[PDB]
């Protein structure tokens, strides 16, 4: 009873009518019958319905319809590229059936609210994916499918047509093909790969222009801030060597015992840290 859901599926209305079938469909993964839920998300929306059984969601920690993580809204291949691939799960036939069975007993014996072993891992995060995690609901995802009479030029329902009248996606784009099983296991997922390419460009971690340099060239200081903000932020890292301050261009230089600590302060800092409700931007030299 009650599905497991994204906030993005469930709807942008707080009031929702949602129907239930006892054994509605096989799950497209572990292939068992399971309680299925439909509901209307919104005014122009599509009537989504749960695609996979609740168990294999608890297993990989995901929405039932979307298969996007609960916290990050990221396809599974991504958050695995983000932490731990070694979760695994047999893809192969009768194994899948077997492992699902056992893991279904293991889950039965848990407190109920926890994605099994992954959650022991799931706490430690934020490497990148937080910064590539999506922020707001994305409703373009629930729109009705593309009317396929109209996309041949004919559709004779006129304005009534609940489907959507517009140009489809060119089958050329590798982002088209998108199997379900595939998106689930984290194989060759085009979306996930795209997000990976997007991850790399994040100006961030390579640093190291020069050896031993712990000099921090800090842009976007501002004249509200004091140094004491700086120190009481940065004593976490280690033994400071010193701090140079310039308020004429509002840039603050810093120096630490080891370069390692400076890299760190970059990492922890870059395009993340803000104090005095004002962004504190960092660069090398």
């Amino acid at each position: 009873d009650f599905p497991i859901l994204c906030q993005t599926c469930l709807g942008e209305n707080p009031y929702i009518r949602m129907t239930k079938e006892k054994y509605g469909k096989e799950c497209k993964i572990c292939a068992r019958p399971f309680t299925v839920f439909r509901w209307c998300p919104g005014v122009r929306m599509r009537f989504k319905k749960t695609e996979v059984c609740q168990t294999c969601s608890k297993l990989k920690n995901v929405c039932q319809t979307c298969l996007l993580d609960l916290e990050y809204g990221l396809p599974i291949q991504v958050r695995d590229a983000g932490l731990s691939f070694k979760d695994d799960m047999p893809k192969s036939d009768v194994n899948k059936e077997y492992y699902t069975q056992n893991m279904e007993r293991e889950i039965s014996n848990s407190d109920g609210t926890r994605p099994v072993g992954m959650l022991g891992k799931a706490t430690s995060t934020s490497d990148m994916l937080l910064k590539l995690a999506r922020t707001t609901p994305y409703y373009k995802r629930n729109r009705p499918h593309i009317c396929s009479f109209w996309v041949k030029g004919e559709c004779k329902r006129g304005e009534e047509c609940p489907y959507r009248h517009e140009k489809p996606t060119d089958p050329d784009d590798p982002l088209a093909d998108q199997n379900i099983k595939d998106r689930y296991y984290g194989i060759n997922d085009p979306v996930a790969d795209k997000l990976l390419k997007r991850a790399s460009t994040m100006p961030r971690l390579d640093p190291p222009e020069d050896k031993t340099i712990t000099t921090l060239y800090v842009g976007g200081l501002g004249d509200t801030i004091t140094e004491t903000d700086l120190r009481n932020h940065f004593y976490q890292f280690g033994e400071i060597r010193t701090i140079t301050v310039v308020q004429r261009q509002q840039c603050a230089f810093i120096q630490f015992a080891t370069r390692q600590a400076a890299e760190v302060a970059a990492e922890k800092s870059f395009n993340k840290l803000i104090v005095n409700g004002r962004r504190l931007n960092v660069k090398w030299g």
Binding site: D88, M89, P90, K91, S92, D93, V94, N95, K96, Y98, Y99
Partner: peptide, 29 residues
């Protein structure tokens, strides 16, 4: 057919006990 040569038939990842198995990996043939 692929329950053998593709994907490890049924998998029991060994249970983990008071020691570190993280590091260990093994060589090819």
């Amino acid at each position: 057919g692929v329950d053998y040569n593709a994907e490890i038939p049924f998998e029991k990842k060994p249970a983990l006990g008071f020691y570190d198995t993280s590091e260990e990996n093994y060589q090819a043939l």
